[PDB]
Design a binder for these strands. Structure first.
Ligand SMILES: Nc1ncnc2c1ncn2[C@@H]1O[C@H](COP(=O)(O)NC(=O)[C@@H](N)Cc2ccc(O)cc2)[C@@H](O)[C@H]1O
Ligand SMILES: Nc1ncnc2c1ncn2[C@@H]1O[C@H](COP(=O)(O)NC(=O)[C@@H](N)Cc2ccc(O)cc2)[C@@H](O)[C@H]1O
Ligand SMILES: [Mg+2]
Ligand SMILES: [Mg+2]
Lengths: 339, 339
RNA sequence: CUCUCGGUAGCCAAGGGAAGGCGCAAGGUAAAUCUUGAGUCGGGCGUUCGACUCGCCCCCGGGAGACCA
RNA sequence: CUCUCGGUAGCCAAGGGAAGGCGCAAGGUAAAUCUUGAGUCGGGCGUUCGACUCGCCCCCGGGAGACCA
């Protein structure tokens, strides 16, 4: 149903650009929306990745044609974050990490498409379109567009300017109506909207998830050891009463709640905190806002919040950790992709 | 003979970078030198092009494997100087112009190879190497390298930065020992020398011809009408005695002399000037330096120099003009490439 | 290619017998004030009793220059 | 996408009844001094007696902004 589908597609997002495009596809064209989410097989994925994964689940639930682009070439072009022979293994590592997360939160992944960027990004039609776009995008616009995505270094490389053009062309070459990513992709997303019509290609809608802030070593690896989860959580900034600058609270806000909501309805939020009897007994918060207000009113202390978040993160990571220990290909990709 | 060959290859050049490479090819490897000259099918070629053409003749005479690269894609990437469908016709126009010049100065062109840049520049191996080089060349270096070749505009396009990288890779993909161009190519040439070894490819030698200065509408089209040649020559700067800033003198220096030398030996320079009896009779200068000294000593006036240069340019252009009027494909390429 | 400035703890660095500043970890959660502790000279070959320092060759990075403008 | 500044002779531009500056062409070769001549408002729809000027919609370019920094 085109209204229900639209509701599922846009829920929990910070920003939707060109919703009319999605609405036209669902209501006028009367077909399933084609979208993709792209990731550069760069460093090891962290707990921040849970946010896009919940959205992928919403998309599949809505009947969308969902593709994950393993942007291997992009990983090379971003300041050589992934080099030459290592990127292929990283692409696999990413593929299996993504599949483990989604399976860990009970999402059926049969209809999820995986495309490796180099499988079309080295064809003549694509190269020609790089040239065409490079003729339309200023040096200053390509630099600005990639500013919050491409690593900014003292002596910037030409690769950094090609990166955002290629991300825009991918929309066309993947044949989608829509691209999904974090709000940190906005500048590239807007570049795509402004420039693809100049090439003869249609404008695409854009879906953006909120970013889960750092904790400050300020992210948690998706295969982090329980004791390392303990340490990273402990060192996180946490002022009594401060809810505005609270990485742990925001983690619960943007990761725990949506994963729990993936049971169903905005009516399942149960956060257990194993509080020591000395400072009151254990407590289970039944809504996020209640948990938020508990902290602001200084009823929930920072150390108590740390206990609850570490236990919940450890809960989430367990099945991903277990899939890693059971899968040798996953283990091989880890070893060869990160020497 | 490796010494004679080297003499022919380097004669009349302003600068030779890495002569040891050429010497190694001719003396140690004991084979013919492989080189290329590249041109972007951009505006209509002018009388400046005579200089590279005399060098091509020297190269073929030396036994070199000579390729002219019709850099169609480059013509597009230089501020869209040649667009989309027009460039193909311009490439042909350039091919036939080049062949007419060389035939007009009695150079056998059978062994001259022509390659269209797009015939390999859109292959996956090339695209991959663009990415590799873009990872090694800074944004600042790509900008500087193309500064005197790529048109500098108020709002520079990304295409301008890709241009010089592609010119460097062409050396490898054309499988040459050496690239020939004007001294205005030096910055790109040096970029190629500094960066190709990083990719695993060998350093190439570089041959650079001097530039024939402007006359100041300050260049003469290779199909310029006699009366238009008259006008452009007349308006050229020419101070009595000034040989240091004298576009016409420099034209004789770098175009007339080498074309005449293509009879043979540095011992044929005959410049006829149809001087009106009022200011002395006609005069034929037997060496350039004598003609130069005549002007410095104020024995040869600016208007007299204008007469001689216009007649000589008209002499050179005649057979090219005649080939254009006899060749319909050449005529078609002109009409469709320059609407 | 030519000139020029650089390379010293993860980062910013001062300098013929290894300063600081940032970061790191310690010291009902963390941070921030504070006071303490851990953490070697791009490479080679020389000259010297002894080289981070002096001589040479090399490797890497920045800036500029490189017909004309 | 949001905000903001622009679009007027080839180029730089000042501005409810088309300034300059550069360039161009003229005025024993040319240039340079000099003095003279040629050369209409991004588009549409309105409001008005009359629009370059006022109102709206559009098209094009620059700069910035766009979670956080
Ligand atoms: N902490 C976080 N919270 C929420 N989301 C996070 C967090 N970290 C990364 N993400 C989100 O997960 C996605 C993958 O991150 P990434 O860094 O691997 N990907 C990129 O930077 C993309 N530029 C890769 C890409 C390449 C080509 C394309 O056509 C499309 C995309 C990004 O869209 C990002 O917004
Ligand atoms: N007035 C002149 N005097 C002497 N030579 C002149 C003159 N004008 C152009 N030339 C010389 O003729 C050659 C062709 O000029 P062009 O402007 O068409 N070519 C370029 O700018 C080259 N960048 C085109 C190229 C592209 C890819 C390559 O792999 C190699 C080359 C250039 O090497 C130039 O030095
Ligand atoms: Mg990544
Ligand atoms: Mg050209």
């Amino acid at each position: 149903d085109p209204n229900e589908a639209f509701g599922l597609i846009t829920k929990n997002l910070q920003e939707v650009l060109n919703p009319q495009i999605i609405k036209d596809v669902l209501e006028v064209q009367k077909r399933h929306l084609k979208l993709y989410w792209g990731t550069a097989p760069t460093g090891r994925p962290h707990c921040g990745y849970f946010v896009p994964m919940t959205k992928l689940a919403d998309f599949l639930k809505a009947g969308c044609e969902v593709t994950v682009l393993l942007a291997d070439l992009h990983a090379f072009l971003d300041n050589m974050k992934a080099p030459l022979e290592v990127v292929n293994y990283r692409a696999k590592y990413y593929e299996l990490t993504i599949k483990a997360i989604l399976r860990s939160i009970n999402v059926p992944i049969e209809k999820l498409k995986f495309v490796v960027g180099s499988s079309y990004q080295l064809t003549p039609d694509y190269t020609m379109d790089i040239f065409r776009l490079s003729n339309i995008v200023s040096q200053n616009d390509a630099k600005r567009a990639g500013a919050d995505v491409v690593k900014q270094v003292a002596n910037p490389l030409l690769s950094g300017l090609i990166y955002p053009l290629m991300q825009a062309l991918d929309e066309q070459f993947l044949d989608v109506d829509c691209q999904f990513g974090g709000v940190d992709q906005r500048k590239i997303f807007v570049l795509a909207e402004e420039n693809l019509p100049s090439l003869g290609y249609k404008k695409r809608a854009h879906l953006m998830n909120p970013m889960v802030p750092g904790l400050a070593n300020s992210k948690i690896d998706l295969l982090e050891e329980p004791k390392q989860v303990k340490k990273k959580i402990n060192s996180a900034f946490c002022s009594p009463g401060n809810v505005e600058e609270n990485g742990l609270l925001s983690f619960v806000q943007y990761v725990i709640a949506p994963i729990q909501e993936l049971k169903f309805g905005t009516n399942h939020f149960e956060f257990f905190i194993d509080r020591p009897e000395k400072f009151g007994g254990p407590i289970t918060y039944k809504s996020f806002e209640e948990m938020k207000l508990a902290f602001k009113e200084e009823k929930l202390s920072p150390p108590d919040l740390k206990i609850g978040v570490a236990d919940a993160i450890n809960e989430l990571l367990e099945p991903i950790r277990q899939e890693f220990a059971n899968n040798k290909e996953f283990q091989e990709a880890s070893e060869k992709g990160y020497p």
